[PDB]
Amino acid sequence: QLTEEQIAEFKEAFSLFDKDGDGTITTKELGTVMRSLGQNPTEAELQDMINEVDADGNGTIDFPEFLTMMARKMKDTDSEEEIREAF
């Protein structure tokens, strides 16, 4: 239901954040991507983004947490699209 190619696209997306390729997205890395996107999250915001999806509380987001976020975002999106369909 999440599909191989999607997890592969998620891994690839993950590496856009996990820039040192260390397997985790750290608030720095998120912050760096966020800023490259012209956003300017605060550490608190970044930390909080990391924190919401940091299932294991180790302070960074590893691929499985990332995938879970993305998977659920994907679910949520589909579910919102469905609701939009009904709206």
Question: How many chain residues touch Ca ion (CB under 5 A)?
Answer: 9
Q: Going by C-beta distance under 8 Å and a sequence separation of 6 or more, which residues neighbour residue 23? A: 62, 63
Span from 1-9, 11-19, 30-38, 74-82 in contact with Ca ion (CB under 5 A): 11-19
Angle at 52 between CA 47 and CA 58, to 5 degrees: 70
Which 36-65 residues touch Ca ion, going by CB under 5 A? 54, 56, 58, 65
Q: How far apart are CA 58 and CA 13, in angstroms?
A: 21
Locate 80 and state its tokens.
């919102």
Query: 10, 14, 18, 66: which one contacts Ca ion (CB under 5 A)?
Result: 18
Determine whether the annotation assigns residue 60 to a binding site.
yes
Rule CB under 5 A: which residues touch Ca ion?
A: 18, 20, 22, 24, 29, 54, 56, 58, 65
